[PDB]
Each structure stands twice: as C-alpha cells, then as structure tokens.
Amino acid sequence: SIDAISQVINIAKAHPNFPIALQWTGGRGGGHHSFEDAHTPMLQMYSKIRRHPNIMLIFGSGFGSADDTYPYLTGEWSTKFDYPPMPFDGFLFGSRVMIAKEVKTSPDAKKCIAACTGVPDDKWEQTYKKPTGGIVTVRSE
C-alpha cells in the first residue's frame, strides 16, 4: 500500500548506498493479494521513489508479454492518466510461467491453468464475489 511504500522509502533513505528493489504489485496478481489498484499508488508515489537513486522500481501483477509491458518500460503508461511519462526499471512475471515446461505443475493442472481466460484490469475486482475469467478470490486461514 501507500504506507508500505513510505516505509520502503525510509529504509532506502537510511542506507543511501545500498540498492533496494521496490517490487510493486497491485491487487490483481496471483496468490495472496491486496485490495489496491495497480496504477494509482504508483502515480502518487513515483516522484518520492525517484527522489532516491538507490531504489530500483519493478512493476508486476498482471503482465505476460512484451506488448503489455513496453508502455511501462517507456513510461508512456502514465500519460493516459494525464501525467508525465514514468518509466520503470523492470518487471516480474509470476502467473505467466506457471505452465512453463520446467515447473512442477501437474499436466492436468497446466491444462486447467491454460483454460482460464483471465479478465482485463478494469474488471479484476470482480473476483471478491464470483468467478471471473476462471479465477475467484477466497480467504486463507
């Protein structure tokens, strides 16, 4: 969340020479997830993060191809929100590789994963209530 990002900034400030990898992910990622939008917290905190050169900005939660990450690599994503371009330092792909040949997912599990169609970002919030794109949200212990 925003407060977590502030805590990360404080850590990076306490050790200005040590590299810190700020892995940012929205609530739309796989597995354990939060309630946050993927874009608003970044639009709020990008400037504060770039105040500190030792922070490396990674973007994740929802990427699976060069086409959908290139706008974030060039920073052109933030212009759609009437902001200046805000390039990112890297990306992480969690769900995208779960059907890779070297992962230990069972073949039927791989087929099940592939059969999911997913949903665009503007509707990911419709997993708290019912299946959407083959995925749903449930509570842990």
Partner: protein
C-alpha cells in the same frame, strides 16, 4: 496610509480591513513590483534587462496586471510609469469590485456550524482538493439547481487536475460545503481492507483568505465601470510596448496578439472568466520565478506540483529559506554564483529512459 502602518505596526488596521480587496489588490501589486525591483537591483540589472532575460510572463488572476506591467518596463526612469499603470488598474479593480459585491455579515449560527466541523470561516471562494473538475461541477450543478440566478456559484480557478476553486456568495458556498461533507469520508477512516473500486472517495475543502468572488458573475457589473475609468485615468497597454509573451489566463494565448484592448481582456479575466492555470502554463521553460505573495504557500509551489517530473524548476523569489526536499528553490538560488545557482529538476522521461 501604508507608510504610517509600516512605520508603526501598533497603529496598523486589523487583518480583516487589510484583506478587503480595495486595500489588498494594489498592495499585492506593490509587493510583487517591489520583489521584482529587488531582484533586478541585486543582479545589477535594469528592469528592461531582467525582462529581456525572460522567455515570457503571466499571472494568476490579479497577477496578470503585474505581469503585463513588468513586460512594459524599459529602464529605471519609465519603471515608475509602469508601476503607476499597474497600481492604478489594481486600485480601481479593488474599488469597483468591492462596490459591486460588498461583504456582509454572516449569521453566527453558520459561523459556529462551520467552525465546529474543522472548517474555516466562510468567504466568497472555496478551495476543493482531490476531486476532478467533473465531480466538482456535478456538485456545483446539484447545489445551483436549488438556488436563484443571483446566488448561483461557479468554478473560478482550475488550479490543477485535482485542485479547483469555487467562487460565489459565502452562503451558497456554505451550502455547497454542507453537501460535500454529506458525501466525504472521515480522514481517520481505514479502507485498506475494502476493494479499491468500492472505496468511498476522500477529499478536502477549505475557504480561501479572500473577501470577494473573483471570476464570478457577481462582479460582472463592474467591468464596464473599470473600463470606463481606466480610459479617464490614462492607463492603457499597447501591444508594441509589450515585448515578451504574456499569456492570457483563460486560453493561455499570447496577449500581444489580442485584437482588442489588452486592459479590457485583463480585467475580464480577473473579474469574469475562470483561470485555467494548466492551460496558461503550457509554455516550455526550465526555470520559473515566483514573485507573487505566499512564499512556500504561493503560486510557485502549486505550479511545481502541477509540473513535477517535466524538467521544470520553480524558484520563489519572494522569500529566503531552506527546502529539505530541495525540489524547488528560494530567493538565494537566483543570486548564487556557484553550481548551486543552477539546479535542474528531474525529467523522468529522460533520466530513466
């Protein structure tokens, strides 16, 4: 008697009388002109040379008059001519706009209700932050449907994407505030466990320290009076005299290319038309000097927040201080001779390309 007040603070009128626009308009103009003078003088420059160093100039509502007057200056002899022009225009703006819509006492019950809810004293201008122009216009329309024509409110200053100001009668603005606080979540509400889409929008509102509804239909009757008076007082701005672009506050266009009277357009912009600050500021520049009042709370900091990450540096020439963030300069940066006098703000598209 401003000299008497400056000499003896003990016999200076109270804050409210100073804040009345017939006082504060020319006084703020004088403050801006004095700051411009100090800068020039310290830099060992004439007003003409300093203006020649500028790519352009503009002003936020009342500041536009100072902008065009500064653009007029050529040397220390004609500077007093320009100053007289500017403060004449401001004096008459204050006088006629106070005559058109003078301030009147508000019922004490409303004052008490506003104070008891962490709200300010009502005034003719309300600042609403963290809301789009569409949302604020929606609330304004809702409020205005219930009100007669003469008491309607409107958006005056479009300061930013989330920064808007509504001008109108203090009673109407109070009613709008009631509507807004009926639709605002408490600041101390935790919504980290609620989905983002369903989260109740949070925002803030406050009344500006002003005493007249600028850029409002209420001051419209004073436009003709001001125009008729300035021709008698011998105040006029010629496009040839202006030698740097001065951007209109309604459309950001250059005033030098205006077909009609520049003074008429300036008064219209101040009293009638809204300020589209983002539209005005579309110019490309590396440094922006803020002479206006307010210091760290003035227009320079607002413009810096609007323009963050575009490689633009804001220097507030009116005050001396230290910014821990160092994101914008102070009076010293204008005169520093080391590299500390040349600070570039970050341009993300270029730094992290």
């Amino acid at each position: 008697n401003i000299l008497e007040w400056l000499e003896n603070p003990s016999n200076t009128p109270d804050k409210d009388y100073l804040l009345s626009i017939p006082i504060s308009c020319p006084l703020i103009g004088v403050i801006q002109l004095a700051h411009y003078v100090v800068t020039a003088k310290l830099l060992g420059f004439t007003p003409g040379e300093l203006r020649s160093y500028l790519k352009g100039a503009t002003g936020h509502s009342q500041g536009l008059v100072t902008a065009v007057a500064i653009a007029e200056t050529d040397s220390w002899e004609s500077f007093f001519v320009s100053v007289r022009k500017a403060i004449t225009v401001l004096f008459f703006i204050g006088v006629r706009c106070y005559e058109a819509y003078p301030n009147t006492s508000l019922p004490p019950s409303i004052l008490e209700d506003s104070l008891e809810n962490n709200e300010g004293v009502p005034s003719p201008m309300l600042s609403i932050s963290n809301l789009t122009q569409e949302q604020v216009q929606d609330y304004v329309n809702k409020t205005n449907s219930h009100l007669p024509a003469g008491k309607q409110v409107e958006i005056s200053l479009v300061n930013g994407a989330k920064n808007l100001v509504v001008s109108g009668p203090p009673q109407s603005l109070y009613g709008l505030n009631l509507t807004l606080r009926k639709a605002k979540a408490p600041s101390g509400l935790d919504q980290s466990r609620i989905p983002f889409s369903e989260r109740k929008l949070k925002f803030s509102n406050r009344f500006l320290p002003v005493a007249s509804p600028f850029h409002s239909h209420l001051l419209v009757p004073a436009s003709d009076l001001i125009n008729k008076d300035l021709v008698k007082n011998n105040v006029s701005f010629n496009a040839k005299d202006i030698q740097i672009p001065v951007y209109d506050t309604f459309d950001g266009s250059d005033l030098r290319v205006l077909s009609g009277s520049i003074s008429e357009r300036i008064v219209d912009c101040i009293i009638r038309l809204p300020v589209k600050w983002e539209t005005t500021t579309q110019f490309k520049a590396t440094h922006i000097l803020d002479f206006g009042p307010g210091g760290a709370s003035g227009l320079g900091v607002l413009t810096h927040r609007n323009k963050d990450g575009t490689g633009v540096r804001v220097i507030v020439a009116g005050t001396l201080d230290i910014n821990p963030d160092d994101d914008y300069g102070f009076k010293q940066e204008i005169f520093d001779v080391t590299s500390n006098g040349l600070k570039k703000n970050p341009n993300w598209l270029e730094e992290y390309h």
